[PDB]
């Protein structure tokens, strides 16, 4: 029947009108990411009323009524004391992808063609507006429709296309067929010490820009890479290759029992202790039963409060998967626990 942590999330973080609010920002923001994760969780929980409430808010307030015609603006909130509105009209493609996947899986599982039609239109718009062929790489997913592509340099975010979602989307043909391959190579090629970067640049005639840099780190974006990989179905033939490349994050977490806040991608040097959400995010990733139980204790004893949006959503994914609240099939479909 119910998923208690999701029920609490609805009460503490989602407005009556269907917007996920990050309370830690003075502008009391909603992001397209937060909306997209709420759609996913509502679908996993078999919660069509909240799915629809969140979807309608997203459509009307981020997408000018129709995500098939307008990619959702990524940031919304208090712009001035008399104006709650879009704060940045640019898209975030990780959210766009999670919205598209959630609509397509809701349409399939709830047998609702309206969701399928909207998911298809949004997917097509993602391909049109934030997928480009990068010389040397092929088709790649940009992090947003503006701001990440210049004539000779591009910036990517390895957390933005979960491998299981890339595998699911290949059913729609190109560019998704090729994007699944370029995404897999992105993940393998940009983790030279086994740590995936938050953001990474590719430069024409030069390749991936992996030199040591205080900004080339596995942090609050890339923690999601390990989470997505951990939640891949074991029968996905590529899960093993990704676990093997990212194994240093598992070995480092097991060593002192603390997920690092930031790891230098070029040197593997860690700094800081990650929040509880990082512990939960590694639950599906850690294959060793003892290392995973150490992190489980931290999530149990330091479960995120109502002032911790990001750790809460990482916990709904990571603890949710740890509790069998949802699974992915080998093709990246939702295998629901309804």
Ligand X SMILES: OC[C@H]1O[C@@H](O[C@H]2[C@H](O)[C@@H](O)[C@H](O[C@H]3[C@H](O)[C@@H](O)[C@H](O[C@H]4[C@H](O)[C@@H](O)[C@@H](O)O[C@@H]4CO)O[C@@H]3CO)O[C@@H]2CO)[C@H](O)[C@@H](O)[C@@H]1O
Ligand Y SMILES: OC[C@H]1O[C@@H](O[C@H]2[C@H](O)[C@@H](O)[C@H](O[C@H]3[C@H](O)[C@@H](O)[C@H](O)O[C@@H]3CO)O[C@@H]2CO)[C@H](O)[C@@H](O)[C@@H]1O
Ligand Z SMILES: OC[C@H]1O[C@@H](O[C@H]2[C@H](O)[C@@H](O)[C@H](O)O[C@@H]2CO)[C@H](O)[C@@H](O)[C@@H]1O
> Is 60 one of the catalytic residues?
no
Cβ-contact 118, 68 below 8 angstroms: yes
- Residue whose CB is less far from ligand Y, 17 or 135: 17
Q: 243: burial class by Cβ within 10 Å (0-12, 13-18, 19+)?
A: middle
CA pair distance 324, 331, nearest whole angstrom: 18
Minimal distance, residue 60 CB to ligand Y, in Å: 4
Handedness of CA 218, 221, 225, 230 (dihedral sign): positive
**Residue 233 near which of ligand Z, ligand X, ligand Y, none (CB within 5-8 Å, type-dependent):** none
The Cα-based distances of 146 to 50, 93, 108, 170, 263 in angstroms read 31, 11, 32, 25, 28
Contact residues for ligand X (CB under 6 A)? 31-33, 74, 88, 90, 92, 94-95, 143-144, 146-147, 221
Q: Verify binding: residue 236, ligand Z, rule CB under 6 A.
A: no
- Residue whose CB is less far from ligand Y, 34 or 270: 34
**Residue 95 near which of ligand Y, ligand X, ligand Z, none (CB within 5-8 Å, type-dependent):** ligand X
Provide the 8-state DSSP code for 72.
P
Q: Verify binding: residue 35, ligand Z, rule CB under 6 A.
A: no
Q: Verify binding: residue 61, ligand Y, rule CB under 6 A.
A: yes
Question: Which residues lie closer than 8 Å to 16 by C-beta, 6 or more apart?
Answer: none
Catalytic residue of the set 94, 96, 264, 322: 94
Minimal distance, residue 329 CB to ligand Y, in Å: 35
Q: Verify binding: residue 10, ligand Y, rule CB under 6 A.
A: no
**Residue 84 near which of ligand Y, ligand X, ligand Z, none (CB within 5-8 Å, type-dependent):** ligand Y
* Residue the block writes with tokens 């990704």: 242
Cβ-contact 139, 183 below 8 angstroms: no
CA pair distance 67, 60, nearest whole angstrom: 9
Minimal distance, residue 202 CB to ligand X, in Å: 14
Minimal distance, residue 315 CB to ligand Y, in Å: 23
- Residue whose CB is less far from ligand Z, 66 or 306: 306
- Residue whose CB is less far from ligand Y, 15 or 152: 15
What residues form DSSP beta bridges with 149?
154
- Residue whose CB is less far from ligand Z, 23 or 330: 23
Task: From 139-147, 188-196, 306-314, 319-327, give the range in contact with ligand Z by CB under 6 A.
Answer: 306-314
CA pair distance 208, 199, nearest whole angstrom: 11
**Residue 212 near which of ligand Y, ligand X, ligand Z, none (CB within 5-8 Å, type-dependent):** none
- Name the token pair of 245: 């490349």
Nearest to 220 by CA among 314, 142, 293: 314
Q: Helix or strand or coil: residue 282? A: coil
Identify the residue among 25, 70, 84, 266 touching ligand Y (CB under 6 A).
84
Identify the residue among 3, 5, 13, 19 touching ligand Y (CB under 6 A).
19
Cβ-contact 260, 205 below 8 angstroms: no
The catalytic residue positions are: 94
Residues in touch with ligand Y (CB under 6 A): 15, 17, 19, 60-61, 84
Residues in touch with ligand Z (CB under 6 A): 22, 31, 33, 220-221, 275, 277, 309-311
């Amino acid at each position: 029947c119910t998923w208690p942590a999701w029920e609490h999330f609805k009460r503490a973080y989602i407005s009556d009108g269907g917007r996920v609010i990050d309370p830690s920002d003075a502008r009391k923001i909603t992001t397209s990411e937060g909306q997209s994760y709420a759609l996913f969780f509502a679908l996993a929980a078999d919660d069509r009323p909240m799915f629809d409430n969140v979807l309608e808010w997203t459509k009307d307030n981020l997408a000018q009524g129709d995500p098939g015609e307008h990619l959702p603006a990524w940031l919304w909130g208090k712009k001035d004391e008399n104006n709650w509105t879009v704060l940045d009209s640019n898209s975030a493609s990780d959210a766009d992808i999670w919205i598209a996947w959630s609509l397509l899986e809701a349409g399939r599982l709830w047998k609702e063609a309206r969701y399928t039609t909207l998911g298809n239109a949004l997917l097509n718009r993602i391909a049109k507006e934030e997928v480009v062929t990068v010389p040397g790489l092929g088709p790649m997913l940009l992090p947003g429709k503006v701001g990440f592509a210049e004539e000779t340099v591009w910036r990517l975010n390895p957390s933005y296309l979960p491998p299981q979602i890339a595998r699911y989307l290949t059913r729609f043909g190109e560019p998704w067929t090729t994007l699944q391959e370029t995404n897999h190579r992105l993940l393998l090629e940009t983790a030279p010490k086994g740590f995936s970067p938050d953001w990474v640049r590719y430069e024409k005639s030069k390749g991936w820009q992996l030199a040591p840099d205080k900004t080339l780190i596995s942090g609050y974006a890339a923690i999601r890479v390990y989470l997505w990989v951990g939640m891949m179905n074991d029968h996905d033939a590529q899960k093993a290759s990704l676990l093997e490349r990212l194994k240093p994050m598992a070995a480092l977490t097991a060593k002192k029992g603390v997920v690092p806040e930031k790891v230098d991608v070029a040197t593997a040097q860690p700094r800081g202790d990650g929040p509880v959400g990082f512990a939960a995010a590694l639950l599906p990733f850690l294959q060793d039963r003892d290392a995973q139980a150490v992190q489980r204790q931290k999530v149990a004893d330091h479960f995120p409060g109502d002032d911790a949006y990001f750790s809460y959503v990482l916990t709904l994914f990571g603890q949710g998967w740890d509790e069998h609240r949802f699974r992915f099939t080998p093709r990246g479909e939702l295998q629901p626990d309804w």
